[PDB]
């Protein structure tokens, strides 16, 4: 009888609750919401973050980060998505990915794993794109797992391991750093105009080692700019940063009179400005919890080197600003550090005059309840930069909620051109 | 037992919902005026399935009204709604240093405006306590369906507002949900673009102290809508006072034409 061809703008409420938990230094999705082209989106999240109960009182605060991204479906499917919308009703169904059989094999995607073992691929593919563009180190290779079932238990359960806060050892110079550059002069002659050309080519190589390892960085150096559709990267909408604090509880019985237990409870807000959605896609929110990288057995570089030369100590501007980067070992910074090839990296020529490390007294070593890196970070450069959550197990009491937990309410309001429920159920 | 708060599964379309309606056209001909009459009769049937299943609803659609004596229904005087909160208590001995226990204590008021009693009868007051229906193993419909077509994902207004209601299974919404006839019901054509469910992380599953529906609501549609109090036993400590208790004072004042006690006991 009466065929409907259009719809008014209606206020849709997409508010819901979230019960979240995770580990230290792993990225995990906490909320998502699919969107349609032409929508007007707004988000506001309010909740409280908690840590597991501590073995002692409060010593060090933790840092919490919240992120929101928008990913069009065209970035995930490509040409398949283009033909999908042009065909219309008789379009081919989109491809899928395979998941595991347990209930928690997709917890990093913020959803319960369906019993069928099959789910759409836009959440898994959007997670990889975010990680490879914003969170991993620029010099390490991309993650290219095809299906969620290809991950190990740790990655699927809690998320991918992220990088420590920047320090001398956790933010070294990239591995493709050269300390020498050779030329092909003659046996008894040299071209000096050719020498000038050699320095010019070395300057462009050093630019791409320190600043420009991505395509959008190269364009930015010329003074241009690239849209997020040019390099197929997710669009960041909002970032929030805050510190979590709490209070202490005193024991009052015979045995525990004089000891204390700390609990962390912090309220937060994450507000995203109004956004106009240009195409069909998804909007995802993620969280990250980290501690400042304090190590017990770390000392000053001048203390660790022992025998000091004029270059080390004088701080002469002519020598500091004209020498190639120096290669140092982990032994020079940590007790029992290594000397082999895997314990070697390169730093600035006089970096020790621009920072001072933190000191932990030997009375605090091997003491439960203090969030510390006991000893030194182990492994090669890749394992040294990435955070390992199992090293923080000595700070918390064992519980089923991991190392941190939160409860938040996401206030989502969208203006959508969709027919009402009454229109959908009445034939005439 | 009463009904859960309205959700996609706890407030489905009524079981007498049709997705097709047949006509008796000719072998090689059709009456098109008869076709117009068929749509008119279908519209009145859909009105009585979605809106008017009681007599007073049918009268209201015409623009009239019925008194509570017409259909012999009770008269509502007042309704009150509030949320109950409390605080936490901390343990301070060796074993329980670091754990907490919550207690709920909320004061309330229920005031009824002055009422003129027209006939002999009774006035009753009742109470109801419910939790929001959060289930641990519940996921998005698009996640549960897996293979997505243009109708599911595009959100095209022409298709959304002109298609019959879709029938879905419990499997598409809950882990280990069923597929048989008793696990099937009907929803709107694009209901998943008008709401978003709550997410419970797997670390909270099978953890005592959180009021949750562990897994999925079981049973047929009748057992799915009605609340079952035995599923909340894992949230409370065992006690003789059930799951909730209250202590209230009812201030009742009435103007009555009754003789005094002195009049009733003195003969003269």
């Amino acid at each position: 009888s009466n065929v409907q061809t259009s719809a008014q703008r209606d206020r849709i409420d997409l508010s819901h609750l979230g019960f979240l938990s995770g580990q230290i230094g792993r990225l995990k999705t906490v909320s998502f919401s699919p969107v349609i082209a032409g929508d007007s989106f707004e988000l506001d999240a309010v909740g409280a973050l908690r840590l597991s109960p501590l073995r002692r009182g409060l010593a060090i605060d933790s840092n919490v980060d919240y992120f929101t991204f928008y990913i069009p479906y065209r970035h995930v499917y490509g040409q398949t998505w283009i033909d999908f919308m042009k065909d219309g009703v008789n379009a081919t169904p989109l491809p899928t990915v395979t998941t595991g059989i347990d209930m928690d094999q997709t917890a990093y995607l913020g959803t319960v794993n369906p019993t069928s073992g099959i789910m759409p691929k836009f959440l898994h593919q959007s997670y990889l794109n975010i990680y490879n563009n914003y969170f991993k180190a620029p010099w390490m290779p991309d993650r290219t797992e095809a299906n969620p079932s290809n991950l190990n238990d740790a990655d699927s359960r809690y998320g991918f391991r992220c990088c420590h806060l920047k320090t001398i050892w956790s933010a070294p110079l990239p591995p493709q750093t050269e300390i020498a550059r050779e030329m092909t002069t003659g046996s008894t002659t040299i071209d000096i105009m050719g020498l000038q050309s050699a320095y010019a080519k070395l300057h462009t190589d050093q630019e791409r080692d320190y600043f420009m390892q991505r395509y959008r960085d190269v364009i930015s150096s010329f003074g241009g700019k690239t849209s997020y559709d040019a390099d197929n990267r997710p669009l960041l909408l909002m970032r929030s940063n805050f510190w979590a604090s709490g209070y202490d509880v005193d024991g009052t019985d015979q045995t525990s009179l004089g000891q204390f237990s700390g609990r962390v409870q912090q309220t937060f807000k994450h507000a995203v400005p109004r956004f106009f959605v240009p195409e069909h896609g998804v909007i995802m929110t993620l969280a990250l919890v980290r501690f400042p990288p304090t190590c017990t057995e770390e000392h000053h570089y001048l203390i660790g080197k022992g025998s000091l030369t004029y270059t080390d100590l004088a701080g002469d501007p002519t020598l500091v600003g004209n020498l190639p980067p120096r290669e140092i070992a982990m032994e020079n910074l940590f007790r029992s550090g290594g000397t082999g090839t895997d314990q070697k990296f390169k730093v600035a020529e006089s970096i020790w005059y621009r920072y001072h490390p933190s000191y932990v007294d030997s009375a605090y070593h091997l003491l439960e309840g203090f969030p510390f890196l006991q000893g030194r970070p182990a492994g090669n450069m890749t394992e040294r930069v990435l955070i390992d959550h199992t090293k923080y197990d000595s700070c918390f009491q064992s519980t089923q909620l991991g190392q941190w937990n939160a409860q938040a309410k996401f206030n989502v309001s969208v203006y959508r051109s969709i027919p009402t429920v009454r229109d959908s159920i009445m034939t005439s | 037992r009463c009904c859960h708060l309205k959700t996609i599964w706890s407030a489905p379309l009524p079981p007498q919902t049709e997705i097709a309606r047949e006509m008796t056209t000719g072998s090689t001909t059709i009456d098109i005026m008869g076709l117009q009459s068929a749509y008119a009769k279908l519209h009145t049937d859909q009105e009585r399935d979605y809106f008017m299943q009681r007599y007073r609803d049918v009268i209201s659609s015409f623009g009239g009204k019925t008194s509570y004596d017409a259909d012999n229904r009770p008269l509502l005087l007042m309704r009150s709604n509030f949320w109950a909160s409390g605080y936490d208590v901390d343990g301070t001995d060796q074993t329980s240093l670091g754990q907490f226990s919550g207690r709920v204590q909320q004061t309330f008021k229920h005031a009824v405006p002055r009422f003129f009693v027209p006939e002999h009868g009774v006035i009753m007051t009742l109470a109801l306590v419910r939790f929001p229906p959060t289930c641990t193993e519940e996921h998005h419909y698009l996640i549960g369906k897996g293979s997505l077509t243009y109708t599911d994902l595009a959100g095209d207004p022409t298709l959304v507002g002109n298609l019959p209601p879709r029938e879905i299974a419990m499997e598409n919404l809950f882990r280990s949900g069923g597929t048989g006839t008793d696990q099937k019901f009907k929803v709107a054509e694009s209901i998943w673009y008008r709401y978003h469910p709550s997410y419970v992380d797997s670390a909270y599953h099978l953890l005592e102290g959180f009021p949750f529906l562990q897994g999925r609501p079981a049973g047929n549609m009748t057992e799915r809508v009605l609340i079952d109090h035995t599923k909340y036993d894992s949230c409370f400590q065992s006690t003789q006072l059930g799951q909730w208790n209250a202590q209230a004072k009812f201030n009742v004042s009435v103007y009555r034409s009754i003789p005094t006690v002195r009049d009733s006991i003195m003969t003269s």
């Binding site: 209606d10 206020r11 409420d13 309010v46 409860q407 | 809106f51 008017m52």
Partner: peptide
């Protein structure tokens, strides 16, 4: 100690009706 994220399961409803069960239900 916690109002918004402990009271209710969603946001305020300012829009079209979503549920139709055949009449009033409480």
């Amino acid at each position: 100690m916690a109002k918004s994220y402990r009271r209710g399961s969603s946001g305020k409803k300012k829009g079209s009706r979503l549920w139709y069960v055949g009449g009033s239900q409480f």
